Design a protein around this ligand. Structure first.
Ligand SMILES: CCCCCCSC[C@H](NC(=O)CC[C@H]([NH3+])C(=O)O)C(=O)NCC(=O)O
Ligand SMILES: CCCCCCSC[C@H](NC(=O)CC[C@H]([NH3+])C(=O)O)C(=O)NCC(=O)O
Ligand SMILES: OC[C@H](O)[C@@H](O)CO
Lengths: 211, 205
């Protein structure tokens, strides 16, 4: 009967936000369990590992019925196939995958700066402008003569890749609000994703986070 | 008949080895292009990016006919679906995927020690034993040793590759994990793999 859905993570966006964005977009009901809200995060996490048989002792963990799912990326791809926001072709699914992997390379770099105190200068002057150019270009290839007011990285429909790129820049802007000034398509794309009803309803009612 | 397959990367195993292992296992023909083997890796790489329109200016890059494919993990997943070495059921494909990302987590830590010379003891005493235990435990649950289903999946190759790369520096690693060891021994003896390895030229990373 579909069973109960529970997402386990710390009281942060981090590696669980994209999963939350997918649920919001699909309008899926689930319990957003966050360590630290009702109790001490450290103690909640330790107890959690004793109660649940996780494969790698890491979160996020997605529980569907009695099913325990680990590794955010795998969970994301699994949810995308099941709710069809993966791409109408094996080839378009590859492209969405490739872009998601790209989001990973640049996001990892942002994390090293915004969280682990790594030189922000290299990020702001070499990594951010460069990777933004890559996405702008990929967006340029699949637009204008493919879509109008709507912007998608793959095909003519929303894929988790659009959600991943939106999440990436939504996060980068909580630190550098002016990042997309020189990237029109990328800027219009994120504005577009942010205004989808289900997404808009989740963002505006989402609690602010540290990361 | 079909389209020429060309794999571009540096003269190393690194992020292209799993793909090469998949091609070997499948018995698929392709040109293994390696920067530096003939010309100068630096120069070849520079010329490469001018000749091919790559999405992120990084390699590996798999070229199939006119198609340009980037990002090693996306490539591995694409090839596995196209050649049916992915989890067959939706849930099994998820398990193969989850295990593969688990391999990336620990492979990432090996790279920081093996290549960017980070702390070698942290990896050896805290990371490696712990992760080998996770893999050993995943084998137990689903138990010819296979992580998912009763057939070979790219996850099996990913695990094999991980420990094969780790062993180039720490040989007696998985001595205390029988299942995991039998599993890698098993994969290494598959005719197509066994043959590919003995003919494979050694290299740092
Ligand atoms: C320096 C790394 C900072 C980690 C940022 C917070 S995320 C929480 C952390 N989880 C992961 O790193 C999961 C990685 C995994 N690849 C995924 O994407 O799901 C965890 O459970 N960690 C358990 C632990 O550390 O014991
Ligand atoms: C950090 C040095 C370690 C060397 C390892 C060799 S990997 C070569 C490197 N490629 C990547 O990092 C690709 C990452 C990508 N996420 C993938 O998995 O395909 C590249 O082309 N780099 C070109 C560049 O950065 O300009
Ligand atoms: O309530 C959410 C449903 O799963 C919908 O996305 C498809 O019917």
């Amino acid at each position: 009967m579909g069973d109960n859905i529970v997402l386990y993570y710390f009281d942060a966006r981090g590696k669980a936000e994209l999963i939350r964005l997918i649920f919001a977009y699909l309008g899926i009901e689930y319990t957003d369990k966050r360590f630290g809200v009702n109790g001490d995060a450290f103690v909640e996490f330790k107890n959690f590992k004793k109660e649940k048989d996780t494969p790698f002792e890491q979160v996020p963990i997605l529980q569907i019925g009695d099913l325990i799912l680990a590794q955010s990326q795998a969970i994301v791809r699994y949810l995308s196939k099941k709710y069809n926001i993966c791409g109408e072709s094996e080839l378009n699914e590859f492209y969405a995958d490739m872009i998601f992997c790209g989001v990973q390379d640049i996001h990892y770099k942002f994390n090293n700066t915004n969280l682990f105190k790594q030189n922000e200068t290299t990020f702001l002057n070499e990594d951010l402008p460069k990777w933004s150019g890559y996405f702008e270009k990929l967006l340029k290839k699949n637009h204008t003569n493919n879509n109008n007011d709507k912007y998608y990285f793959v095909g003519n429909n929303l894929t988790y890749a659009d959600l991943a790129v939106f999440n990436l820049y939504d996060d980068i802007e909580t630190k550098y609000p002016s990042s997309l000034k020189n990237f029109p398509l990328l800027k219009a794309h994120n504005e577009f994703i942010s205004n989808l009803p289900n997404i808009k309803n989740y963002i505006t009612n989402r609690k602010e986070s540290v990361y």
